[PDB]
Amino acid sequence: YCSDCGADASQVRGGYCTNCGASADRIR
Numbered sequence: 001y002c003s004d005c006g007a008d009a010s011q012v013r014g015g016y017c018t019n020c021g022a023s024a025d026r027i028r
Contacts, residue, residue, distance in 0.1 A: 003028050 001009060005020040015024045 001028060002026055 001007065002012070002017045002020065002022055003026045004022040005017065007017055007019040009027055011018050012024060012027055016022065017024075017026065
């Protein structure tokens with residue numbers, strides 16, 4: 001999941017969360 005907004009990990013692309021724009025390292 002994204003620690004910043006809660007989105008599912010499958011929504012990360014190009015180094016960012018595609019919902020909130022968090023950097024890839026905010027994914028856990």
